[PDB]
Amino acid sequence: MPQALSTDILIVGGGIAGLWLNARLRRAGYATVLVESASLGGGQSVKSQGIIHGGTGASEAIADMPRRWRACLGSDGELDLRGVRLLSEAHYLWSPVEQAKGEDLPPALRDKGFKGKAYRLTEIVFDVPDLIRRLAELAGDSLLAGERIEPLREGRELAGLCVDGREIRAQRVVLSAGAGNEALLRELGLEQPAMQRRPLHMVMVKAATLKPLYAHCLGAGPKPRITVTTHPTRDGQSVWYLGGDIAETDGVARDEAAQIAEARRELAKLLPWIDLGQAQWATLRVDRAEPAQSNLLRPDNAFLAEQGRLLVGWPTKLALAPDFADRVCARLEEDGIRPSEHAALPQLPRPPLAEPAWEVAFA
Ligand SMILES: Cc1cc2nc3c(=O)[nH]c(=O)nc-3n(C[C@H](O)[C@H](O)[C@H](O)COP(=O)(O)OP(=O)(O)OC[C@H]3O[C@@H](n4cnc5c(N)ncnc54)[C@H](O)[C@@H]3O)c2cc1C
Ligand SMILES: [Hg+2]
């Protein structure tokens, strides 16, 4: 028998949404346990491009995100993320806000061959592994590696969970397990809220010759043709990580070589002044985990649902993790749930941190 535990809020899943919420709750005086079955940040989060989007009824929530995340890096934000690494102070639009010129242009667009125009946004780009590291620090002793989860009932009521045979009692249980939310819901005998999986086929290029770039390339059409972010590697090279429309439906249908070949064509057109002849190339397939369209959604918002003492959801964007936290805290607030008194947590087995794919795919 492992030592039984007691807290206020028990969170399942240590990606950005669970970790951010955990940090908010602890800051507000709640006791928590956060349960992760693999590595923290290791589903979608560390695989994101790290861009904090900010672009109004439903669309209000997203618009305020860059300001909110920025605040956290200083003295007066909703979390203490001071000393978290930004990859870039700005993300850019790139066409054929501020119009950027001369040495205000991103390094990769300073070339004389750069025709067309770039626009600087308030949007920010975070080093996600370093973000996750800090949120794990803010978690303190709440963090628990646990693989196998069962419900802990009191009649029909959900009193907590049994994690690797350990009973953990809690006033609420929150499922922030990404793609794992579906099977956890089934484990509780639930089928709502339903989940969808929208795959991406992301491309990574690694070379010594790359110059920093954080941008959506627009042709015609609302959506980015490609989305570039630059990621430094431990050995002193960089990696350009490519999302956008190249990583969507037709990218998904292309195999690795066809997807790489498509990526080479497009970089030769858009950034011909950067020699990729010595570059290494890889791709990455990953599913976005979202509420199904069959749920009651507001689009540019986090999604949350509940059944009894169970709260469950998805941020939809990494950007919107603070909105996911707000939605949980307003339920707690409306329901009158306050911090109670609990024994200190013992020593617990701790989940590992995830590495970014650019360190694993080449190194
Ligand atoms: C390629 C890509 C690029 C993206 N780029 C951006 C971007 O630039 N900007 C932006 O705002 N958003 C972006 N997103 C969206 C963003 O990544 C997600 O919305 C967000 O990271 C999801 O956070 P999460 O914590 O809900 O999910 P996850 O990060 O998937 O975390 C879920 C966690 O739960 C754990 N878990 C699963 N099952 C169980 C279980 N049974 N028991 C215990 N733990 C479990 C997992 O191991 C995982 O760590 C991107 C997504 C992808 C796929
Ligand atoms: Hg472009």
Residue numbers in the entry: 1 to 55, 65 to 105, 125 to 391
What are the paper's exact sentences on this?
The structure of PA4991 was eventually solved by a combination of molecular replacement using a truncated search model generated from the sequence of PA4991 with Rosetta and phase improvement using a low-occupancy heavy-metal derivative obtained by soaking crystals with phenylmercuric chloride. The refined model of PA4991 consists of one polypeptide chain comprising residues 1–391, one FAD molecule, 41 water molecules and two Hg2+ ions bound on opposite sides of the thiol group of Cys245, albeit with low occupancy. Three loop regions, residues 55–67, 106–125 and 248–249, lacked electron density and appeared to be disordered in the crystal, and therefore were not modelled. FAD is bound noncovalently to PA4991 in an extended conformation in a manner similar to that observed in other members of the GR2 family. The ADP moiety of FAD binds to the classic nucleotide-binding fold, including the diphosphate-binding fingerprint motif GxGxxG, which in PA4991 is represented by the sequence Gly13-Gly14-Gly15-Ile16-Ala17-Gly18 at the end of strand β2 in the central β-sheet of the domain. In the vicinity of the isoalloxazine ring there are the side chains of His53, Arg316 and Lys345 that potentially could be involved in ligand binding and/or catalysis. Enzymatic assays did not support a function as a G3P dehydrogenase/oxidase or an amino-acid oxidase as hypothesized based on the three-dimensional structure. The conservation of the active-site arginine residue involved in the binding of negatively charged groups of the substrate in these enzymes suggests that the unknown substrate of PA4991 might also carry a negatively charged phosphate or carboxyl group.
Analysis of the structure of PA4991 identifies this enzyme as a member of the GR2 family of flavoenzymes.
